[PDB]
Amino acid sequence: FTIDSARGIFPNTLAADVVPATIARFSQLNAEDQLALIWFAYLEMGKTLTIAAPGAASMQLAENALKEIQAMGPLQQTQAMCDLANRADTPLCRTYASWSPNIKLGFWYRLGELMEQGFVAPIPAGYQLSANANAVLATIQGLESGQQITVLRNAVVDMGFTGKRIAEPVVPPQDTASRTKVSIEGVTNATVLNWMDNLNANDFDTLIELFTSDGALQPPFQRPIVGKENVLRFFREECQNLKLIPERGVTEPAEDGFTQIKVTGKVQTPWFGGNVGMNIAWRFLLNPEGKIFFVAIDLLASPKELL
Numbered sequence: 496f497t498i499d500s501a502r503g504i505f506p507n508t509l510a511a512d513v514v515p516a517t518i519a520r521f522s523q524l525n526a527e528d529q530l531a532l533i534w535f536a537y538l539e540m541g542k543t544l545t546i547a548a549p550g551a552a553s554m555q556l557a558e559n560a561l562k563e564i565q566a567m568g569p570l571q572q573t574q575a576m577c578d579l580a581n582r583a584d585t586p587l588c589r590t591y592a593s594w595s596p597n598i599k600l601g602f603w604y605r606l607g608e609l610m611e612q613g614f615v616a617p618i619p620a621g622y623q624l625s626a627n628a629n630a631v632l633a634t635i636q637g638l639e640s641g642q643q644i645t646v647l648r649n650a651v652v653d654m655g656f657t658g659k660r661i662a663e664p665v666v667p668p669q670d671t672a673s674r675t676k677v678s679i680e681g682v683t684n685a686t687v688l689n690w691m692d693n694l695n696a697n698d699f700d701t702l703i704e705l706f707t708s709d710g711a712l713q714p715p716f717q718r719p720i721v722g723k724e725n726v727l728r729f730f731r732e733e734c735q736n737l738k739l740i741p742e743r744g745v746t747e748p749a750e751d752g753f754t755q756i757k758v759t760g761k762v763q764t765p766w767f768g769g770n771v772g773m774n775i776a777w778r779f780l781l782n783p784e785g786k787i788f789f790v791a792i793d794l795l796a797s798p799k800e801l802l
């Protein structure tokens with residue numbers, strides 16, 4: 496096996512590829528249409544989904560950029576937002592690109608509050624979406640909540656212009672005594688259980704020791720992240736305060752004393768908590784010693800993809 500060939504394990508797993516499909520359609524749109532479409536999606540979603548407040552540390556890291564935009568005239572505020580959507584090369588776009596996803600999301604969270612209040616230039620009153628934009632919004636509004644929030648996150652992350660990396664502080668791992676242990680029907684594999692339990696405890700230093708030196712983690716609709724340095728950085732930047740709720744799985748032999756394990760269940764992001772349960776598969780390829788050579792995390796097409 497190579498990392499790129501391991502991508503093919505459990506090929507019956509039907510991923511929600513409508514998500515990258517919809518992001519590709521979104522990316523073609525006029526910048527003003529991109530901003531208006533997300534405004535409309537965000538307003539409707541907020542009627543039933545409450546977004547968690549951005550962390551204090553995140554907001555502090557975004558404060559100077561938010562103040563710069565708040566100080567602009569309305570025309571310049573709209574232009575700054577269009578620059579981000581267009582991935583234009585500007586100082587603000589380079590600052591934005593240096594940020595972790597959570598800082599980018601917190602930035603837009605605060606601009607959305609200020610736009611609702613009228614302190615930052617809002618989407619024009621009675622703005623009508625382009626033909627392509629109206630259809631992209633219709634697609635988004637027809638998706639399950641877990642797919643909707645993934646489209647919005649991916650759209651936000653893709654903005655700005657690419658390097659110095661700015662991320663939230665890493666909260667210390669959960670005290671041992673208060674930690675939960677997951678149970679998975681059909682899976683007792685210590686590596687898989689330790690994966691779930693250490694991620695639920697934000698214990699990234701214990702988690703990274705489960706990998707081979709050349710091992711990779713593949714997040715939903717992303718290329719594999721390869722090697723302990725890159726995987727640990729990903730954990731520390733993006734993987735704080737998740738709740739993994741694995742349900743059931745299957746354990747099979749693979750080539751050369753390797754083991755392949757597929758688990759299905761749900762994950763909660765701290766942005767939505769129990770309000771959005773994303774249907775997830777984990778696909779593990781373990782070496783004979785039980786180290787992770789490859790683990791993929793897939794957003795599933797529907798609840799019918801759960802085992």
Ligand SMILES: CC1=C(/C=C/C(C)=C/C=C/C(C)=C/C=C/C=C(C)/C=C/C=C(C)/C=C/C2=C(C)C(=O)CCC2(C)C)C(C)(C)CCC1
Binds near residue numbers: 600606694739762
């Ligand atoms: C832009 C914009 C606006 C504001 C937009 C805002 C404010 C959007 C906010 C969106 C948010 C807050 C979305 C959050 C989504 C989070 C997700 C989808 C998280 C998923 C996590 C997963 C699936 C993790 C799974 C993993 C597992 C289980 C592992 O085992 C290993 C690690 C890992 C792979 C990470 C306004 C309105 C102003 C209009 C103008 C433009």
